[PDB]
């Protein structure tokens, strides 16, 4: 029934499509991004999404515990997934904090990013219309930098705590608490609006973008590939782990959703249609963003790669500009940020719900019902609030960029995808798993799925992983700022926190199990109830 | 046990006439999980229609299928002596698997 | 895919035991789920048991679930059905059928073996 379809659609369609994909594509020069993007999509993305859903549906266990019924030895995959979601939920909601701040700033006769008579603006401001007539800055960019973000000169300078963004984070976390606690904002007929309006606004933005003068230059930037860049491991990791991010895999959240589905339900077609929806909205909203970028390039007289931030703020530069080019800008500003809030908040609801269902399944003795499950959820939300609050400082953009790069992205996703596919294909067995799928959905996976799990996904993950280490380049925030070495170490700390769960859980399970080593391994390789 | 029943248990017919057969289930059957089998007199059955409308490899194109939920049907544009056989509908949605009572076309 | 051939039909006393065989050829027998279907002297088809490709999932009809045991030999491409206590209602024509895909049905049927319990 459509509870599953709606849960998945609202979960893994979200800010990954509207906000992350455009900025990673822009960061990597546009067209070159799509080749590895589609290679990963059809090699690993859809098959691993189906794999996660099928694990969940087969075991009827949530995220961590399903591996006890498939391969206990590699139970560390579940803990790695859950900690990945723990960090994602910490940093992902800061985007909703920014969206809330923008929305409250929309309630004006004139939008604050339309011109720079305002106080925060540098003396070097030039209103974008007149620039074509020094290091001038656009009001749309420096609203983002100096009012919303109040950007510190570096991560080494935390600066003050933004007392307004703190309450924006508090508001969105309260919304998450009351939605997950009471179960509100799901399964109702109101979902007819909640699931449809965001795509309507995306269509409005796309129609605006494609009609702006200079859109064609942006689309050429978007679709023409410079094969030279591909030589750099950066585009490959960015695209492949953007696939893994956008599909919410390696989180165990999709596995958690699958655990609620009936054992004999045929999910394959639904999974393929949902994947089409996800990758399609990403690719299509690419045309919305890059048309606006081409328009800005034509208006200001600078190359497309120079017009905006090569980073997280790309959406908060581009769409704010677009809504300024429409009748009654305040109306469309409010609608844009309500669309962004709804689209991200359901993906936040799904991710937090998956985290909680995965965690309560470990100890159902406690955490049973509203008498204590509500308190556990409240504790999780409070902790995630205090951690996300670090990104609300003036230096918070650098911390957010470090989180977005390392904590739930990059090699840590490749690691989990590799081990999931490797376990199922070679430790458990493709022959066993295809028979299980035949028992559940009624027909075997077929060769695309079987070989994607057996060879293609492991090969792609290992290739990108090793390629990024042979041709290493460090992180930079906006192509100028270089992180200090301790910040790079912190990013690797975040990534390794997720990755090391597999080795350490393996050793923890080899210990405390009885008997010689051989029987220990054989016992841990054997499923359990 | 989902009981399947076919109404026209026997069908007196002559070449050139059109035919439609009915197959009702005690419980709803998914469209992809109902099939029709032919069995010539004195020989083992052969798959005839699957997924409620997809014709098997050897069946002539004159056959067709339709249905949804609790009721299904199979039809012939025009019969021929080669079509004189017993046709069984079968649900494959859940166990035990059950075949219909069968309908025999007499000419 | 070409061929299925049953063997082992015959005459046994009421309450007796009998084992049927069904050899396969022309396809990789280990890759397809297999089923036995039963046709009474009244020509009515009745399903008996299913065994999946790896033999790990097995299903029985409610009228045989306590008395019939199904098994397969993937190393020899032969399918087996064993009846422990044959009731009078168990006399019938027995077909082994290839049923790998539930959305596609029984692709191929064997020639069948008659079982008599006079
Ligand atoms: N957060 C993750 N990873 N997935 C949710 C869907 S999306 O908003 O990132 O496209
Ligand atoms: Cl995406
Ligand atoms: Na969403
Ligand atoms: Na997505």
In CATH, what number is assigned to the domain containing residue B58?
2.60.40.10
A251: number of Cβ within 10 Å: 32
User: Cα-flanking dihedrals φ and ψ of residue A264, to 5°?
Assistant: -90, 10
Tell if the CB–CB gap between A442 and B94 is shorter than 8 Å: no
Is A65 in contact with A55 (CB distance < 8 Å)? no
Q: How far apart are the C-alpha atoms of C10 and A483, rounded to whole Å?
A: 84
A248: Cβ below 6 Å to ligand 1?
Answer: yes
| Domain residue ranges of chain C, discontinuous segments joined by + | 3-108
Query: From the alpha carbon of A92, which atom of ligand 1 is closest?
Result: 1
Is A222 in contact with A25 (CB distance < 8 Å)? yes
- Best interface-test mutation with A: which of C98, C102, C103 has the largest number of A CBs within 10 A? C102
Pairing relationship of beta strands C3-7 and B34-39 according to DSSP bridges: unpaired
Q: Can you say whether the dihedral through the CA atoms of A262, A263, A265, A270 is positive or negative? A: positive
C-alpha distances in angstroms, A333 versus A106, A111, B106? 6, 8, 73
Closest Cα in chain A, distance from residue B40 (Å)? 28
* Coil, strand or helix at A431: helix
Read off the tokens for C2. Answer: 């070409």
Pairing relationship of beta strands C34-39 and B103-105 according to DSSP bridges: unpaired
Select from A248, A278, A404 the residue to mutate for testing ligand 1; criterion: most ligand atoms less than 8 Å from CB.
A248
Residues of chain A with C-beta less than 8 angstroms from the C-beta of C54: 431-432, 435
Residue at token pair 């800008």: A329
* Coil, strand or helix at B99: strand
Is A324 in contact with A140 (CB distance < 8 Å)? yes
Q: How far apart are the C-alpha atoms of C12 and A432, rounded to whole Å?
A: 38
Length in residues, chain C: 118
C-alpha distances in angstroms, A32 versus A26, A45, A83, A313, A468? 10, 19, 32, 21, 17
The alpha carbon torsion through A133, A149, A484, A318 (nearest 10 deg) reads -50
Query: From the alpha carbon of A245, which atom of ligand 1 is closest?
Result: 3
Q: In what order do the strands lie in the sheet with C58-60?
A: C58-60, C45-51, C34-39, C92-98, C113-115
Please identify, in words, the CATH class of the domain defined by A2-524: mainly alpha
Instruction: Report which bound ligand comes closest to the CA of A282.
Output: 2
Binding-site residues on chain A for chain B (CB distance < 8 A): 264, 266, 442
Q: How far apart are the C-alpha atoms of C8 and C115, rounded to whole Å?
A: 9
Peptide bond into C50 cis (omega under 30): no
Give the experimental resolution in Å: 3.1
Residues of chain C with C-beta less than 8 angstroms from the C-beta of B47: 104-107
Query: From the alpha carbon of A350, which atom of ligand 1 is closest?
Result: 5
Is A245 in contact with A7 (CB distance < 8 Å)? no
C-alpha distances in angstroms, A184 versus A28, A270, A340, A353, B20? 40, 25, 19, 12, 50
- Cβ neighbours of residue A379 under 8 Å, at least 6 residues apart? none
Taking the centre of ligand 2 as the mean of its atom positions, its distance from the CA of residue C83, in whole angstroms, is: 56
> Residues A381-387: contacts with CB within 8 Å, 24+ apart?
A381/A173, A381/A176, A381/A177, A381/A352, A384/A86, A384/A89, A384/A90, A384/A93, A384/A173, A385/A169, A385/A170, A385/A173, A387/A90
List beta partners, residue A219.
none
Of C42, C38, C43, the C-alpha closest to C106 is: C38
**Structural domain span for residue B56:** 4-105
Residue at token pair 């007199």: B41
Query: From the alpha carbon of A14, which atom of ligand 1 is closest?
Result: 8
Technique behind this structure?
cryo-EM
Is A352 in contact with A178 (CB distance < 8 Å)? no
| The 3-state secondary structure of chain C, one letter per residue | CCEEEEECCCECCCCCCEEEEEEEECCCHHHCCEEEEEECCCCCEEEEEEECCCCCCEEECCCCCCCEEEEEECCCCEEEEEECCCCHHHCEEEEEEECCCCCCCCCCECCCEEEECC
Residue at token pair 């077609």: A269
Is A132 in contact with A299 (CB distance < 8 Å)? yes
Q: How far apart are the C-alpha atoms of A518 and A169, rounded to whole Å?
A: 51
Which run of H or E residues covers position A353? helix A329-360
Read off the tokens for C50. Answer: 């299913």
A198: Cβ below 6 Å to ligand 1?
Answer: no
- Cβ neighbours of residue B91 under 8 Å, at least 6 residues apart? B2, B4, B25, B29, B33, B34, B97, B98
Burial class from Cβ neighbours inside 10 Å (0-12, 13-18, 19+) for residue C88 reads exposed
* Coil, strand or helix at B88: strand
**What part of B 59-98 touches A (C-beta under 8 Å)?**
92, 94
Is A48 in contact with A251 (CB distance < 8 Å)? no
DSSP structure class, residue B10 = E
List beta partners, residue C69.
C82
Q: How far apart are the C-alpha atoms of A390 and C114, rounded to whole Å?
A: 78
Whose CA is closest to atom 8 on ligand 1? A14
| Angle in degrees, 0-180, between the axes of helices A76-106 and A314-323, rounded to the nearest 10 | 30
Q: Minimal Cα distance from A443: which residue of C? A: C101
Whose CA is closest to atom 6 on ligand 1? A12
**What part of C 59-88 touches B (C-beta under 8 Å)?**
59-62
User: Cα-flanking dihedrals φ and ψ of residue B64, to 5°?
Assistant: -150, 165
CB burial readout B47-81, b (16+ within 10 A) else e: bbbbbbbebbeebeeebebebeeeebbbebeebee
Whose CA is closest to atom 4 on ligand 1? A248
A78: Cβ below 6 Å to ligand 1?
Answer: no
**Fold of the CATH domain C3-108:** Immunoglobulin-like (2.60.40)
Whose CA is closest to atom 5 on ligand 1? A12
DSSP structure class, residue B64 = E
Of A243, A253, A318, A303, the C-alpha closest to A19 is: A318
Residue at token pair 């606004």: A201
What total number of domains does chain B contain? 1
Read off the tokens for A317. Answer: 């530069």
Is A340 in contact with A16 (CB distance < 8 Å)? no
Read off the tokens for C102. Answer: 């539930």
Q: Which DSSP string corresponds to A152-183?
A: -S-TT----B-HHHHHHHHHHHHHHHHHHHH-
């Amino acid at each position: 029934k459509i509870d599953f379809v709606l849960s998945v659609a609202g979960g893994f369609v979200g800010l990954g499509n509207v906000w992350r994909f455009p900025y990673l594509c822009y960061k990597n020069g546009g067209g070159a991004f799509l080749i590895p993007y589609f290679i990963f999509l059809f090699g690993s993305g859809l098959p691993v999404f189906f794999l996660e859903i099928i694990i969940g549906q087969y075991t009827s266990e949530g995220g961590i515990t399903c591996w006890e019924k498939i391969c206990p030895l590699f139970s560390g995959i579940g803990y790695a997934s859950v900690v990945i979601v723990s960090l994602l939920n910490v940093y992902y909601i800061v985007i909703l904090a920014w969206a809330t701040y923008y929305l409250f700033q929309s309630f004006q006769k004139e939008l604050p990013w339309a011109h720079c008579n305002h106080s925060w603006n540098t003396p070097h401001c030039m209103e974008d219309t007149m620039r074509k007539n020094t290091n001038f800055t656009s009001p749309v960019i420096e609203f983002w930098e100096r009012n919303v973000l109040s950007l510190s000169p570096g991560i080494d300078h935390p600066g003050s705590l933004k007392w307004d963004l703190a309450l924006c984070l508090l508001l969105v976390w309260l919304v998450c608490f009351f939605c997950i606690w009471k179960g509100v904002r799901s399964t109702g007929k109101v979902v007819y609006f909640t699931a449809t309006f965001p795509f309507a606004m995306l269509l409005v933005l796309l129609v605006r973008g494609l009609t702006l003068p200079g859109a064609g230059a942006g689309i050429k930037f978007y679709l023409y590939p410079d094969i030279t860049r591909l030589e750099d491991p950066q585009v490959w990791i960015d695209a492949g782990t953007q696939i893994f991010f956008s599909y919410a895999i390696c989180l165990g959240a999709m596995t958690s959703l699958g655990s609620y589905n009936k054992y004999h339900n045929n999910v394959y077609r639904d999974c393929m249609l949902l994947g089409c929806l996800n990758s399609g909205t990403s690719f299509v909203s690419g045309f919305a963003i890059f048309s606006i970028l081409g328009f800005m390039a034509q208006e200001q007289g600078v190359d497309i790669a120079d017009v905006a931030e090569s980073g997280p703020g790309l959406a908060f530069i581009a769409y704010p500009k677009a809504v300024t080019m429409m009748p009654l800008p305040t109306f469309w500003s409010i609608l844009f940020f309500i669309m962004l809030l709804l689209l991200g908040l359901d993906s936040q609801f799904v991710e937090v719900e998956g985290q909680i269902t995965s965690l309560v399944d470990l100890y159902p003795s406690f955490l049973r019902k509203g008498y204590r499950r509500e308190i556990f959820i409240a504790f999780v939300c409070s902790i995630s609030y205090l951690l996300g609050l670090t990104m609300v400082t003036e230096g918070g953009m650098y911390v957010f960029q470090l989180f977005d790069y390392y904590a739930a992205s990059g090699v840590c996703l490749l690691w989990v995808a590799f081990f999931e596919c490797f376990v199922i294909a070679w430790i458990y067995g493709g022959n066993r798993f295809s028979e299980d799928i035949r028992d559940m959905i009624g027909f075997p996976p077929g060769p695309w799925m079987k070989y994607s799990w057996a060879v293609i996904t492991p090969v792609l993950c290992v290739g990108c992983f090793i390629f990024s280490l042979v041709k290493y380049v460090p992180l930079t925030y906006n192509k100028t700022y270089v992180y200090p070495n301790w910040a790079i170490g912190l990013g690797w700390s975040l990534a390794l926190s997720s990755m090391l769960c597999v080795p350490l859980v393996i050793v923890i399970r080899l210990c405390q199990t009885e008997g010689p080593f051989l029987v220990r391994v054989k016992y841990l390789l054997t499923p359990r109830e | 046990e989902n009981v399947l029943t076919q109404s026209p248990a026997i069908m007196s017919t002559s070449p050139g006439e059109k035919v439609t057969m009915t197959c009702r289930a005690s419980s709803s059957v998914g469209s992809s999980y109902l099939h029709w089998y032919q069995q010539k007199s004195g020989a083992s059955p052969k798959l005839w229609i699957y997924s409620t409308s997809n014709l098997a490899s050897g069946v002539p194109a004159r056959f067709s299928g339709s249905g949804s939920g609790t009721s299904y049907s199979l039809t012939i544009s025009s019969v021929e002596a080669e079509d004189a056989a017993t046709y069984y509908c079968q649900q494959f949605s859940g166990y035990p698997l059950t075949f219909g009572s069968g309908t025999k076309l007499e000419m | 895919e070409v061929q299925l051939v049953e063997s082992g039909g015959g005459l046994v006393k009421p309450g007796g035991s009998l084992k049927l065989s069904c050899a396969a050829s022309g396809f990789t027998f280990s890759s397809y789920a297999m089923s036995w279907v039963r046709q009474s002297p009244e020509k009515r088809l009745e399903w008996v048991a299913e065994i999946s490709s790896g033999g790990r999932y097995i299903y029985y009809s409610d009228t045989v679930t306590g008395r019939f045991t199904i098994s397969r030999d993937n190393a020899r491409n032969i399918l087996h059905l064993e009846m422990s206590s044959l009731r009078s209602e168990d006399t019938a024509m027995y077909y082994c059928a290839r049923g790998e895909v539930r959305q596609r049905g029984f692709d191929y049927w064997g020639q069948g073996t008659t079982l008599t319990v006079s």
